Symmetry: C3
Subunit: 131 residues, 3 copies
């Protein structure tokens, strides 16, 4: 079959927001699949997919590292301003969910950056089984 | 059918040029399709394609943002040293034309950087119609 | 036929290493094909592939440029801290091998950074011949 799924959204709100930023730029993503408002990414794709996250510089320090399902830790989108970090590929389980850790030092500063999260389907698993 | 099109060129001229730079490194692009001398990109591909522009740092300030056909503004290749900015995907119309705006402040300095413009075909629209 | 090959490894050793870093994070690469311990990349893929190298900043100066088979020089993974530099595409010969040049100034400092080398197959040459 052909899952033909693509997904990508852009954030550009005006100024001071009440908290974290949602996404109003629907560029391409009918099913949505991964809500960037909560970051709860439910990926049924099953296959090989191209993921790309935009890394804010923020040289003021702190450690950003997104959790990865099945191992926790695992920085695929690593930002240092059984466990390893990867960027190109994407070892993800069917239905599993990814979550961002954003807490590595309390005494810090207050800020609200912006981030773009795109990720398009490249190839899906076409059975590929052999009894 | 199979449009099988790829296009990408590299710039590396010696030193001071009389103005903007052309491209003499033919890596892979028989049809050419998008003239990087004028930037008039006529894309007949129609489908999903992979585009990648190289961002010069130039921290000296000024705002670089490439125009996008149908809306004007629209920074897909955004560089800040209905309208939104995207990097991974590429919503382009068949025959559409992309153009860069490079004017956001007159009182500035004179310089001539270099830029690499690669972009390879990923998947094309194979009819996909259903009466 | 279907070569179905993917390859990518991650390095994260503890602290001071005796020399260059190997790779213990097997993310996806059964054949291996390109040993990152020596960098001797033997690519039989033959087709179009997506390559991505991670560039360490190292603003302390020096010139890093990976050699390219068939021409020598040719900086595909260029880092300046018949010959041209490209990043997206990948003009590689079947069986040829790529090697990194890491010597552009003797009077320098001693350091041992880390690097991630991923590269996944996109499309292979399916005969495409026409007597």
């Amino acid at each position: 079959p052909v899952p033909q799924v693509a997904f990508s959204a852009a954030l550009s709100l005006p100024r001071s927001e009440p908290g974290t930023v949602p996404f109003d730029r629907v560029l391409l993503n009918d099913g949505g699949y991964y809500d960037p408002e909560t970051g709860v990414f439910t990926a049924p794709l099953a296959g090989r997919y191209l993921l790309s996250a935009v890394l804010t510089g923020h040289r003021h320090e702190k450690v950003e590292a997104v959790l990865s399902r099945s191992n926790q830790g695992v920085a695929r989108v690593d930002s240092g301003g059984t466990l390893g970090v990867f960027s190109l590929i994407l070892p993800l389980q069917a239905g599993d969910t990814v979550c961002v850790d954003l807490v590595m030092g309390q005494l810090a500063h207050s800020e609200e950056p912006l981030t773009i999260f795109s990720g398009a389907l490249l190839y899906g698993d076409p059975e590929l089984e052999h009894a």
